[PDB]
Amino acid sequence: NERYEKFLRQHYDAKPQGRDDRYCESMMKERKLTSPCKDVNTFIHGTKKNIRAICGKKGSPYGENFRISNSPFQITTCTHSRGSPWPPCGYRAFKDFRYIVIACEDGWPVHFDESFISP
Template sequence: MVIPGGPQGIEATMALKTLVLFSLLVLGLLVIVGAQPPAFKRFQERHMDTGPGPFDPPYCNKTMYQRNLLKRNFNTFVHESLKDVHDVCWEENYIFKNRTCNNCHKSSNRMSITECSIIGRNPIRYRTKNSKKYIVIACDGIWPVHFDGSE
């Protein structure tokens, strides 16, 4: 029997509060994940690789094939944490290559990237070039959705 105000009642109340707080946290995370635009997932698939790098010459051939990006003549992979790339969306708007882009942002620091350039079509082969550059991305609100380039 639980006596209100007794030690068992206090433990039951604390357990209930903990359960409610945990449930709210899980619900909040689900809402955040569900609110991500589909373009953000495409951005991750096409441009994110949090591996440490630098990468050897076969990297682009292997990665472009694994991610089904073989129709692209050029692609860039960013080797930074998703948080660091996500933070670029908080930078001020940036005009890149004299284009009007209301939602472009340039990283405040150089980031580790790998550029993949097509060098052969039969079979498809890519050149792998590792470097550290500023990245320019377009954001949908707070979500990176398009890799616009690097400089």
């Protein structure tokens, strides 16, 4: 399932290290989100079984197209240094523990809603 794959590439990291600014710049480059520099991108930590579970019992409908988790997830948000999308993409990290909102397709996560955790 490629759509599921793109999701894990852009939003998943089981065991992170540092979770600081340097973690974001390295990660965004490694996961290919610097062409162009993605504005905001969040990585979810933990296991993958719990993320897909949000598409099942451990989740609830959040509108017509999304699901919200029944429990919080450890997450790291990488925000672009809005200014200079040139090859060097600047980022700063922000660690949080929140309930998340994803989009599911046939039982698999396919999209992460960044605006839900803006506040």
